[PDB]
Design a protein around this ligand. Structure first.
Ligand SMILES: COc1cnc(O[C@@H]2C[C@H]3C(=O)N[C@]4(C(=O)NS(=O)(=O)C5CC5)C[C@H]4/C=C\CCCCC[C@H](NC(=O)OC(C)(C)C)C(=O)N3C2)c2cc(Cl)ccc12
Ligand SMILES: [Zn+2]
Length: 198
């Protein structure tokens, strides 16, 4: 019935992938119970840092990447959900189910990657475990892993970046190309598709 209809939670930032050292590592900034509360209220008073966020809904965890002042992630992860912020829930600024892309205004304190202009096919995929994986660009939206990995390794990383050697955002990871449970390639949303969206 209509009087007791439930709301869907906000996406919640629960950690980050630190890329600002000589070492990449994941940091958690909020645990599960805290995440649940924040998802319902939408009020997240934590201080955000960096380019790559670890984000959660009540049922899934994945990544989000800031580019040009926008925090971007995958639709199949975020749906049309708001994101928790210091002032309450923030509505998506961009939503495109066909591209599997959503975005919100980037959090105060985050930093954005610059969209890539270098034309390079030597790419680097950043996973939720802070692995930095070399990927050879193969097309507009595809790249090959130099070393194939079981998918289990890539699961939870949709929304993360593909970076060029200069650390320029090239795209947002979206899907794994798989055979017999082995990812041999990745599908991504090119940074150029985000700029058309913007
Ligand atoms: C809303 O539009 C949409 C929804 N879903 C998907 O694709 C789904 C979700 C991804 C996914 O899990 N991403 C992931 C992911 O990690 N998602 S997530 O973070 O874990 C989830 C969001 C919380 C990058 C892949 C990671 C693990 C692989 C597990 C299953 C792989 C199957 C699969 N691959 C496949 O679809 O590839 C084709 C296009 C070549 C046919 C796949 O990766 N996905 C299947 C797509 C894919 C594409 Cl190309 C375009 C749109 C679109
Ligand atoms: Zn470049």
């Amino acid at each position: 019935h209509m009087a007791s209809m439930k709301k869907k939670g906000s996406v919640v930032i629960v950690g980050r992938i630190n890329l600002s050292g000589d070492t990449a590592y994941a940091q958690q900034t909020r645990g599960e119970e805290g995440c649940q509360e924040t998802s319902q209220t939408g009020r997240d008073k934590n201080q955000v840092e960096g380019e790559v966020q670890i984000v959660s809904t009540a049922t899934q965890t994945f990544l989000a990447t800031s580019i040009n002042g926008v925090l971007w992630t995958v639709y199949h992860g975020a749906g049309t959900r708001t994101i928790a912020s210091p002032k309450g829930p923030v509505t998506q600024m961009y939503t495109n189910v066909d591209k599997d892309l959503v975005g919100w205004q980037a959090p105060q304190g985050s930093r954005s990657l610059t969209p890539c202009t270098c034309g390079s096919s030597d790419l680097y995929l950043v996973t939720r475990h802070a692995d930095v994986i070399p990927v050879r660009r193969r097309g507009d939206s595809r790249g090959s892993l130099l070393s194939p990995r079981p998918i289990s390794y890539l699961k939870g990383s949709a929304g993360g970046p593909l970076l060029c050697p200069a650390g320029h955002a090239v795209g947002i990871f979206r899907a794994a190309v798989c055979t017999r449970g082995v990812a041999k390639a990745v599908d991504f949303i090119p940074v150029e598709s985000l700029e058309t969206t913007m």
